[PDB]
Design a protein around this ligand. Structure first.
Ligand SMILES: N#C[C@H]1C[C@@H](Oc2ccc(S(=O)(=O)C(F)(F)F)c3c2CC(F)(F)[C@H]3O)C1
Lengths: 110, 109
């Protein structure tokens, strides 16, 4: 196939600050339904802490890729297994607070 | 004149350098529509004088996994070349694609 995925950007707390429109096919929501909300809000309660600790660590990893697997609640009311790969970017011309760039794919847990 | 954040945009490439996705923001910066870029090689866009360096930068990316391009020209939709600098990050799964954070050095606005 050609596995489906979408890019998002987040501030360090988890809030969606940018979402690529490929999110419709992957998790069923429109970008405007994600923008402004925290990724942790769509996350299964057993995986929320793992996701919060992952956000915290990705900033310590010096722009390196961090990967996390978690259950995301689609707009079709299903728990989807999502592998989110993320890394921080900070423009080295600036001292602006870094932010977090993600790619999000529905994967199989097996 | 545009600030740094307003001059930064994302693109995603398959391993052969083809665009698979581009931020809408490229349009106000370099004139292209993301739609017209899909399927085209990044390489079709580089100034010939920066070509050599972009090939090495790529090879370095494939072995390290993250690399900063350093300064290069990209041909803009409506004539002339714009200066960029790019950070490249390979995404491997279980290499799946390359994430590029692109920053336009040239003065814009
Ligand atoms: N818009 C736009 C762009 C076309 C240009 O693409 C690259 C710029 C620098 C690079 S690079 O190789 O210098 C870098 F990824 F390390 F930055 C690369 C690309 C495409 C790529 F395959 F991801 C990669 O070859 C950025």
């Amino acid at each position: 196939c050609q596995p489906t995925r979408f890019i998002s950007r987040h501030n360090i707390e988890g809030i969606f600050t940018f979402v690529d429109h490929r999110c419709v096919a992957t998790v069923g929501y429109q970008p405007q339904e994600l923008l402004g909300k925290n990724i942790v809000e769509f996350c299964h309660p057993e995986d929320q802490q793992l996701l919060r600790d992952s956000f915290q660590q990705v900033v310590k990893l010096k722009g390196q890729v961090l990967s996390v697997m978690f259950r995301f609640r689609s707009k079709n009311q299903e728990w989807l297994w999502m592998r989110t790969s993320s890394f921080t970017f900070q423009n080295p011309y600036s001292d602006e607070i870094e932010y977090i760039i993600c790619t999000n794919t529905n994967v199989k847990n097996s | 004149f545009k600030g740094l954040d307003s001059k930064t945009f994302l693109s995603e490439h398959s391993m052969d350098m083809k665009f698979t996705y581009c931020d809408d923001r490229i349009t106000e910066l370099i004139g292209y529509h993301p739609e017209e870029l899909l399927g085209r090689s990044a390489y079709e866009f580089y100034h010939a004088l920066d070509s050599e360096n972009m090939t090495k930068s790529h090879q370095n990316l494939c072995t390290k996994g993250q690399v900063v391009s350093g300064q290069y020209r990209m041909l803009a939709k409506h004539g002339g070349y714009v200066w960029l600098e790019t950070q490249g990050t390979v995404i491997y799964n279980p290499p799946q694609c390359i994430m590029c954070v692109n920053y336009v050095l040239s003065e814009i606005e």
